[PDB]
């Protein structure tokens, strides 16, 4: 269910609600959280 997007922000957004760790990566118009490692 990775959350469509362009930037970075636009994904930390998105990546908080679902994961606390905003640190991800927005490729390909796919955002795919890192989480907490």
């Known amino acids: 269910?990775?959350?469509k997007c362009?930037?970075?922000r636009q994904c930390w957004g998105?990546?908080?609600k679902?994961?606390?760790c905003?640190?991800?990566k927005c490729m390909?118009?796919?955002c795919?959280?890192?989480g907490c490692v």
Do not use: H, L, M, V
């Open 32 to 34: 795919k959280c890192y």
């Open 6 to 8: 362009s930037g970075t």
């Open 22 to 24: 905003t640190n991800s």
């Open 28 to 30: 390909n118009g796919k």
């Open 14 to 16: 998105p990546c908080k």
């Open 18 to 20: 679902q994961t606390t």
């Open 1 to 3: 269910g990775d959350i």
